Every structure is written in C-alpha cells, then in structure tokens.
Design an enzyme around this catalytic site. Sequence first.
Site, PDB file in Angstrom:
ATOM      1  N   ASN A 130      -1.472  -1.685 -20.028  1.00  0.00           N
ATOM      2  CA  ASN A 130      -0.441  -0.750 -20.472  1.00  0.00           C
ATOM      3  C   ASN A 130      -0.806  -0.015 -21.773  1.00  0.00           C
ATOM      4  O   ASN A 130       0.078   0.355 -22.549  1.00  0.00           O
ATOM      5  CB  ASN A 130       0.896  -1.513 -20.568  1.00  0.00           C
ATOM      6  CG  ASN A 130       1.421  -2.009 -19.176  1.00  0.00           C
ATOM      7  OD1 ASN A 130       1.257  -1.318 -18.170  1.00  0.00           O
ATOM      8  ND2 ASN A 130       2.038  -3.209 -19.131  1.00  0.00           N
ATOM      9  N   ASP A 158       3.471 -16.086 -14.312  1.00  0.00           N
ATOM     10  CA  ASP A 158       4.258 -15.258 -15.217  1.00  0.00           C
ATOM     11  C   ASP A 158       5.075 -16.177 -16.112  1.00  0.00           C
ATOM     12  O   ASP A 158       4.616 -17.281 -16.457  1.00  0.00           O
ATOM     13  CB  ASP A 158       5.081 -14.271 -14.367  1.00  0.00           C
ATOM     14  CG  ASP A 158       5.355 -12.961 -15.078  1.00  0.00           C
ATOM     15  OD1 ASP A 158       6.192 -12.972 -16.014  1.00  0.00           O
ATOM     16  OD2 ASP A 158       4.726 -11.935 -14.701  1.00  0.00           O
ATOM     17  N   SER A 163       2.818  -4.083 -14.917  1.00  0.00           N
ATOM     18  CA  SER A 163       3.336  -5.335 -14.393  1.00  0.00           C
ATOM     19  C   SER A 163       4.478  -5.150 -13.409  1.00  0.00           C
ATOM     20  O   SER A 163       4.822  -6.113 -12.713  1.00  0.00           O
ATOM     21  CB  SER A 163       3.848  -6.218 -15.535  1.00  0.00           C
ATOM     22  OG  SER A 163       2.820  -6.554 -16.435  1.00  0.00           O
ATOM     23  N   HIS A 166      10.827 -11.459 -17.483  1.00  0.00           N
ATOM     24  CA  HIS A 166       9.673 -10.738 -16.910  1.00  0.00           C
ATOM     25  C   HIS A 166       9.299 -11.246 -15.527  1.00  0.00           C
ATOM     26  O   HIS A 166       9.083 -10.452 -14.620  1.00  0.00           O
ATOM     27  CB  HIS A 166       8.493 -10.884 -17.877  1.00  0.00           C
ATOM     28  CG  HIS A 166       7.315  -9.984 -17.651  1.00  0.00           C
ATOM     29  ND1 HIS A 166       6.154 -10.440 -17.065  1.00  0.00           N
ATOM     30  CD2 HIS A 166       7.023  -8.756 -18.141  1.00  0.00           C
ATOM     31  CE1 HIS A 166       5.227  -9.502 -17.131  1.00  0.00           C
ATOM     32  NE2 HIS A 166       5.742  -8.451 -17.760  1.00  0.00           N
TER      33      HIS A 166
END
Length: 279
Positions: free
Chosen positions: A161, A39, A224, A69
Amino acid sequence: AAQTNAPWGLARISSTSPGTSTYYYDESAGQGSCVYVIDTGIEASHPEFEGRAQMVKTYYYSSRDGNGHGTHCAGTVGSRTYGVAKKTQLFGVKVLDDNGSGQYSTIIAGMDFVASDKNNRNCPKGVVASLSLGGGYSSSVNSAAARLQSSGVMVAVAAGNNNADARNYSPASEPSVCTVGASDRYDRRSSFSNYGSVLDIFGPGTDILSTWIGGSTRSISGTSMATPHVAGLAAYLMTLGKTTAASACRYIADTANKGDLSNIPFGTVNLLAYNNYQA
Ligand SMILES: [Ca+2]
C-alpha cells in the site's frame, strides 16, 4: 445466480464493464473448498458467516479478532452478503496482534501451520490462503510463502500500500505465489497500490464494504481488501473444476479482463480479476 445491490467489487469481478450493481455467480459458490485467512483473527460468531468460520490457531493470548482487519478480509472471501465464495469454509490463523502488527517469525510460523493443518480438514475441492499483510523484503518470509504454495495451497498476497514497486516487500515479491494490487470502482489503479512486474492481477480494493467486529460492517481500503477477492475467486473456480491450487493464479490472470485499468505504470500487468460467469 444473481445477487442484486451487491458491493461494487463483487459486481465488478462478474462483469466486463464497471458501474453495475449485481453479482453473477454459479450457485456452487465455493462449496467444498477451504480458505485460510492469516491475519488478526476472525469474528466467527458474526451472523454473516453462518457457522462456516472458525478460529483454528493463534499465537497470542486470545484467538479473538480485536482489530477488525481479519474479519473484514474473511467477509470478502466468504460472508453471505459480502463474500465472493459464499459457501466456502473459513479458517482463521491469528498471526497479527490486535493493533495489526506481527513479527516475521510468527508470520512464518503461521504459513507453516496452514501447510500442515490443511491435512486435518475436509477440503475436497482445495485450499486457498489469503495474506493481507506485508513488510519489507525478507528472504525468510518469501520462502515460507513459497513452501506454502508448493504444499498445494493457493497463496494470494497483498501487493502492498506504498505506491511503489512491490519487489521491495514480502511476501508480495515471491514469484510463486499470486500478488494482488488494487483498483477502484472507475477502473483505475488505486492511489496506494504497489505495482511492478511481480504483480499477477488486480482486484477491487477501494471502498470495500465487508463484515467488521462487534457484529457490524465497514467500508475500508487497501490491497488487503483486494487480496481476498482473488482468494475467494480461486476457491470458487476450484469448486467448479476450472483449475487447481498450483495453477489458479495462471488461470485467473489468463481469464482476466485485459486492458481496462488506467493509472498502470509501464511494466505492470493491466489485468483485473473476472469470474467468467455466463448465466
Ligand atoms: Ca505467480
């Protein structure tokens, strides 16, 4: 064990029904397992990780999470208050810049790294990899996720998404790994959640409170956020001896709550991850 006034998504994966507020889990809570969050980095100094996280690899000038994130995702796996697998080890692998973007060759380098680096760590119950990242279909990136799973790391990836069939995104579309869509707190598919037969499982992914950078918290949304709930659940179930890296996606989908979700298109699984805990 019971954690009262839990975040909804934690409560949701230890329940058969929506709407409660307590997280029921076995006190082992992932001890001896290891999860790699691939990430934007992790803020390992955050009080919530209690010394259990570190950054092991970057591909940028800094290992720091300047985005947030990856600190959020790691918190859902592993933080003391916000995590599923509260006692696991948490490894950071920064493949995304501080605006959240990578190039696929670096994301590919990151998966190869975990396949190697796991042998330098102490993970007697096993190793999970969580990838809350995706792009359009690339065979190279699908094959890297396939190798990572083959090596013996349980790979969990975000379905994506875009409210579309995830067959067109990678590594969501790779068959051998564990593709994760997102649900909301009333047991609907989240509005943005990709779908399709390449999905394995759904997890909580709307309004997910977790750790953020600067020693803070925030509640955010996405596949996520659903992905590390599943990654943490795999770490948990491997400490309990219930499964192995090879077959934890199958065990999760088999032991899931079945038929609870609404807004599921014909052709997609109607399975919501459950931890099977009976105090
Ligand atoms: Ca699978």
